Amino acid sequence: MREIVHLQAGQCGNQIGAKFWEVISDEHGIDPTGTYHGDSDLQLERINVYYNEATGGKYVPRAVLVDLEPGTMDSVRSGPFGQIFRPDNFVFGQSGAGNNWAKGHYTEGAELVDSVLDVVRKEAESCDCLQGFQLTHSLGGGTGSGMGTLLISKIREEYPDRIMNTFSVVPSPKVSDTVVEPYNATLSVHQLVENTDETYCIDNEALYDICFRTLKLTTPTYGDLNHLVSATMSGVTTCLRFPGQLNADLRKLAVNMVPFPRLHFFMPGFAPLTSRGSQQYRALTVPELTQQMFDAKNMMAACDPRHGRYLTVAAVFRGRMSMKEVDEQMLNVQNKNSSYFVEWIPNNVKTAVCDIPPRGLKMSATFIGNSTAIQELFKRISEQFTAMFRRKAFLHWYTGEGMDEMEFTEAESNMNDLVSEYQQYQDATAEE
Template sequence: VGVAFWEKIIQEHGITPEGLYTGNNPQQIERANVYFTEAQGGRYVPRVIACDLEPGVLDTIRQSKFGGLFRPDSMINAASGAGNNWAKGFYTEGAELLDQVLDTIRQDVERCDLLSGFQLCHSIAGGTGSGMGSLMLQKVREEYPDRMMSTFTVVPAANSSDAVVEPYNSVLSIHHLIENSDMTFCLDNQALGNICLNVMKKPLPTLGDLNSLVANVMSGVTTSLRFPGQLNADLRKLAVNMVPFPRLHFLMSGFAPLTSTQVQSYRHVTVPDLCQQIYSTNNMMVDVDPRHGRYLTCAAMFRGKVSVKECEDTIWNYAEKNASSFVEWIPNSTQIAVCDIPAIDSKLSATFLGNNTAIQETFNRVGEQFSKLFRRKAFLHWFTDEG
């Protein structure tokens, strides 16, 4: 997921796989230093730290088209793997790598003029993303308590599973996410697969297709940080508007326009179209039906040549018509941001974030699976052996 995001924003900023700027719009590079460090010879280097407890994934990145872009010392991996075990990632294997990772973070932070916060991409089903992800969250929070911590978290899907112990890993991680994260954008492969099948009409979606959907959302959420716009919303501003109570920071996300490639050239996208799509259940990137709950707060981020007034009017009209979907004790609960620079593949696009009470369905599902295993004390010895 992380690599898909970097590939996306490298293209948006007009940077080549070698790290050189070849764009034609000065606005592309005006605020590139939010995500990139400018090195010698005008090379732009992503400010990223990639860690894993096994070498396979990072080796793939090193050998990819964009492999030469990342700093070698920002790719940190062990050799043994976490074996889908949260305790290995948190207590044993992950803890051994921790000092090296924190040291690299410290060096990167010292190079910053003004550190806004951290973004963590991980999955809470396996061992590394859940265990080591929780450990990183906790330690970074201790070292930088006043900085924003946002996470893009892939939660286990309802009908597909890589590991039997997913419910254990997830429950242990969710506790850390509740305590140590300021904003958590929930994603799941089931919902992403459904979008590819039903909305984009791809009969056999690959992981690359799913990742590019997530990259769209990540790129949309961070647009206001990366480009000058008419109405900006940085990470902190977003969190202030989206999180009414500290523990309720688990957000659903959506993106528009999503259409099949055959239909794309026949459609003219308008702001009302986008509004209808981003609130649609089919476009949600987590397997939850927002109609089963109510929205506490929402954010809509528009990109492209569009009038702020039109965006505001469309969103207000939607909120008035569907007043029953929003809680009445937070008036004007939708925040809007507008950025003039369009996404690469569409002239007009919108990213949606919603803090909806229906997100509890995800946690209930994981909780039920956890209880079934825990009642029988199944697989527990793998965790207790690690401490």
């Protein structure tokens, strides 16, 4: 029936997707073998969204792993749950991307693209009716960013009536991994703003700071960040995975949370981030969760939302509490913190509570909103791109690949238009 086809790209995307699959398998009672070991009630009816019905009740994942380096499939297969996926979906090339977007899109994006299109089609027609496609990737390299944009564009051209939601990773000048990362980001943002419904912003430095200052972890690693993002996406999709009283969906959120198609970025976040020693001493209530979803300390941005005005807010809850407390909380927040959200648009907070609690934890609530804080990221990205493009350093590689330089010019022109739009809508005056 209503199923979601999941897509993979980039080694970081691959590992976060594997972590998400492991998390949902553990939550919904799935052994690493492939059978079912759950004991719940709602874990059988709507289980078919991410799985497929097969003989012996052995459910199979629905995810296509796209990569150029064979070293990723061996890594992800050796894990405790790497033997449960479909090896056919592991379409890998022979040459590496070399953190090049133009080369990866041009060279490794012509002969290998056909196979993944074939498999994603066969998956789409294997089902009756679908809603959208989820692709988790990163802009740090040529694997996720090089082909994610192309595949999203292709699936949009084929099936315009589908959900283009993604969780790409935004760069950070403080914590960098690629020398030419700003070039890749500039190339990627054009396609994300031209041929993408919605996109969420993901940073690793902010998650590192969050864990260091609140979780108090000895040796935080990428596994912790993968666990956090997996929990985030699980909270995102439980509106459809586990129906409750006030159920929502992805397209409703996309329509209600996006005032203009050019601005489809969001700000994800999860509320209960406490240390190990603090798990036995905590008060589970509404105002605490409200403060944790409203303060900028718990958010996973490397910026400050207080620099701008709140545009759209959605508070998705997952538990059995009430409805009155949420509305009174948002009411008093809008009353007191009047200088933080657009005055022209009242009631920018949406209500959403999932009656089905998650496994392992009794209280959970994620924060999805679009606040005025990405402007600084966009402006600094534009500035660094201009600085790099002034004298044309690290350009001969892209030039020798074949593509010209006017693409950079039009991309930066679009970037300037976007920042001008963002800044002139930040000060949304009521009238003259």
